[PDB]
Symmetry: D2
């Protein structure tokens, strides 16, 4: 019921950066630079611009001081300058509020379009960006926990099929999803760049930003982040993991920044660039779907997420999911999960694993 | 309370092997050989003798068919044949039951002494053992989850200070322990070979065997064991982990064999061979003591453990711990743990960490 | 001098598979299945079809028994069935010999076009392929040296700029290259799928196939391949490495199969999918350009490569390189290389790095 | 030829530290601290005291400014204060020169004995040492290339059996060695702490110090050291490696400090603490004995090593090896090596492996 525009979709290359509003810039800096080791592309007293080890565009993350912590923009790079015009015509046809700035919203981005998308998320589309030193061989700077690329976003929205069709029309291809036999969709993963995803939809009250994910080269780099957080006596900011995912097959960790923005560290998913890439559907009751090793998913992972802003910088009103809750059907009083389909041995009932 | 003998202690080198009684030899073989990739030194219809990738002695694990799953013997190798005579005299002086066989209790071990020790555990001391092909460079056999050495045992016993003193007289050096501010000791780790431990004491009803631990080379080898168990749809046999330990600083995993015998996979602890190796004491309420990342310890890890047999093959009676329970004081209804000492933020009241 | 056709280029997704002719199918099976752990999708007395751990198309490697070991086809998957028609019209405009088979040349591929390309290489274009079980979570099968994807081909050709221009018109984008200060190009890397490359051109007498490359997840997986070859006492089949590449930044190893076909194992290069991805040009005398740690490149790496076949199955005639030789200008008696540009300290004159001369 | 004393040998725990004389303290600091990431326990204008990630004694490496770069002392820790007295009586009975300092030779060491041992090496024995913060869980400091322990020394001496017997009488057990079928020993490895070695003897002119070795946790840590040296454009200081050893089975790398002192990075050898630990003998012509993958050993590895000092601080005179040279018999012009014993295929005659010859 989000209508497909007659205007052609912009050609989206990949997720590129997120602008997060933070309440204490210095404490956010400590987390993203001193703990996590992201690289400074620019900073002043209002903003810090950060990039990953292998990036050549200006930044992957912008931290902006503001009164209420929230996602301000999730940005996708498009293939040509003309694609920003296409994005503008496309969202205007969808009836969405748009704002175009020929010189960008943040430093190091040129001509850019921000929109309040049909799911209430602040999307940005741009092509032009200031190139910086690509640090991919700067092993003199490489951290034991080095974050090497921006991998994806993950959005909480109440109606997953409705959002999925809209992103499919935008050219995103679904690689994996979670469903049940009654026909409810709980989550979907979709891509442009030929990894498992550039964004994903998690069923829940929204719009809220569930997480931003960075990749590492190897699994030991993720381990090191946990080990460092232990040494810094901030292990209470490790929310979930480390683990192996079922969906995506990636090794992963979820941690919480000082404003409780959730960051995923992620590595070693698989190639999805062929247009007939096989789509994998998991049953919501399969206890290996989210953590392959069957470790339980903490309730906060399902219930907590970041606010998102509209184009005026005000928090978007939240719409409550009416479809079945993944939390309730798996770990709630009436929920259940299995290790082996149809086997009570290794099943969990009204209880997590 | 357990007196120090006048007789000299045997010079113990290291933990060497465990004999575990198992109820179904085929299912146990499938776990230890097919799932975990241990190497068969010998087998027949009653027993399977298994060794790790870098071992040269006959075995690190003997699976013996029997009617009740249990630990039958935890064996330590001693430095010389005369040390087996010393062990016998030492345990005689302690008034323990002993049994000595010049040709061994299990295949590939020679002159051996088994004892019912003062804590009710079946200990074996031996020197003589049949050498086998050391597979340490057999990369044609190397598994992505390869188990490379036997590292330690861990014993459940009701009174940790009492056991600790006895193990110290026997020559084990305590490297780390867990205590509280009220005089209670909850666990201790102690060594002969220059790693964090060869055995360890966990406070609880006992004697029971908490686990046997094998090492891997690298952390990714432990991750692969988890990944393989997922692919085999036996992830319900992963009990706890993977994680980083606080105590020992080792990367770890606990899994359960077909008879619920607990196996730890362990890697990358530190050198303890100097005699003034600094001893580390953790507070029982420190939520980074067991898992450094603050992940919760499932109650089964505290409550479940394997039976142990006496020298007649009968199960040892269980004596209940009267000291405070590590489970109850940390994750029970009146339990408590902290992330930072004295900080309410990141503390847990009456429940386990991580929500 | 290869002109840009008026006909549209086919939309190529990625490299997909190679067909290698092998002389002893059993010995080749031992290497690829028993030593390297590739997964069999089909086999019989004549061919063995193999795939990597994360693949869903039918195969990444076909071993075909034949009298003369050679590359028979390097295959690229195209985006749609109609792109096979575009490939056909494109190479016909180029004046190249083509052959179309609606039911494929090898099992598990459908409608396919093979061509003798302007550099003399047998390229295949196809869309249709038989899907197989994607083994990406089959950790019960996973080996300590697991090969997880097909990454690229590497082609030996005498005139690199000529070939580079042709591949650019086909839609490949150059990511890295090696040149000198007086305008000679020694090598170029170029991509479709958003890694450093799907194919690459190495200056030398050609056409010859330099190597086929497979990926691993981690660097330790590459180390294990070496360790296993030592245990199997075939360490003489380790040609070069393991190392860190300069060009591509990937961890690597080169090994030789029973017919001397060269296989590279490769991991952890970077993303190139943005259309203004910065190109990187290295100086040929930079001793960190091929091995970042400065380890010497063995001369066989420069001189030895596989024969390639035409569409009749006959060996393509070799044409000699007339531009300067990378081997000669870096490690030959009149060559040189440097660690730091302009610094005599850490420079090597008339010999390779680390203290060896050429055998 | 070196008699076993009647006096009892001191009980040696392990290698503990080396004192190296360096010519430019700031340049040496840049290598050991900025490049390699060792942790500073103390420094002033004359010395730098350094320790590894998991150490609790004061240091593993003392860098001492002086006019001539050299090993000044290889230090072993003993089990008790009374073992220092035993060391003094033991070496006095061997007829060696000894010097005892109740408050140490270097800061953070207490009562210490230095000796000119029968092979001309400056050994120190001590028990007392200042404990420092053990940084084994300080993951806030941990480097991608972190050196976690001091593992061993390696000594160049002309007569290996002569030195091996003396070290055996001192309590070291030989774990592996290299010999040929004609009675020559080329190298021996020997331990106290239950790893492959605490010291080792390499046949050549001596006394000279071949290297000091530090361990890492994982193989990727050694890879990162290489990668960092590339990024710092000091790849010319990577001498040999990275590799898998045959002898010791450890993953390894050799690098060269500013005064050319050789440092090995090392990981994942095996347990040797049992008294009947099987002793492994490799043949000197086995091309997998030093590098398991068959990579050639550069001539500098055989010919270059650090000077060692006597107790007066003067350089020890070098005695020439008369036994056969490992270089000459393996990679020399009349050399030979094999991949598979008894197989001509994969054998090397008068040259090194993998296409190289002596520079
Ligand atoms: Ca001979
Ligand atoms: Cl998940
Ligand atoms: Cl624990
Ligand atoms: Cl290269
Ligand atoms: Cl060596
Ligand atoms: Co995610
Ligand atoms: Co344990
Ligand atoms: Co290549
Ligand atoms: Co060494």
């Amino acid at each position: 019921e989000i209508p497909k525009p007659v205007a052609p979709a912009p050609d989206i290359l990949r997720c590129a950066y997120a602008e997060l509003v933070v309440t204490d810039l210095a404490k956010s800096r400590n987390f993203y630079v001193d703990v996590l080791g992201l690289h400074v592309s620019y900073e002043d007293e209002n903003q810090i611009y950060l990039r990953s080890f292998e990036e050549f565009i200006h930044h992957n993350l912008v931290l902006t001081k503001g009164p209420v912590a929230a996602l301000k923009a999730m940005a996708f790079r498009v293939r040509t300058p003309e694609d920003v015009d296409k994005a503008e015509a496309y969202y205007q046809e969808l009836g969405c509020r748009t704002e175009r700035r020929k010189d960008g919203f943040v430093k190091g981005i040129g001509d850019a379009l921000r929109v309040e998308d049909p799911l209430g998320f602040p999307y940005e589309f741009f092509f032009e960006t200031t190139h910086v030193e690509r640090l991919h061989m700067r092993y003199d700077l490489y951290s034991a926990g080095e974050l090497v690329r921006l991998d994806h976003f993950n959005q909480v929205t109440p109606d997953v099929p409705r959002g999925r069709k809209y992103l499919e029309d935008l050219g995103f291809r679904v690689t994996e999803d979670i469903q049940d036999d009654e026909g409810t969709t709980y989550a979907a993963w979709m891509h442009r760049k030929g990894t498992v995803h550039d964004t994903a939809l998690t069923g829940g009250n929204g719009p809220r930003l569930h997480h931003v994910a960075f990749s590492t080269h190897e699994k030991h780099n993720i381990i090191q982040i946990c080990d460092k957080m232990g040494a810094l006596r901030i292990s209470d900011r490790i929310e979930r993991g480390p683990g192996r995912h079922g969906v995506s097959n990636a090794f992963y960790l979820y941690i919480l920044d000082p404003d409780n923005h959730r960051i995923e560290i992620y590595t070693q998913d698989y190639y999805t660039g062929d247009p007939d890439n096989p789509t994998i559907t998991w049953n919501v009751h399969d206890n290996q779907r989210r953590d392959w090793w069957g470790n339980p998913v903490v309730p906060s992972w399902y219930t907590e997420a970041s606010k998102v802003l509209d184009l005026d910088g005000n928090v978007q009103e939240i719409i409550e999911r009416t479809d079945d809750s993944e939390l309730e059907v798996t770990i709630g009083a009436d929920g259940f999960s299995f290790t082996r389909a149809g086997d009570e041995d290794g099943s969990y009932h009204g209880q997590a694993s």
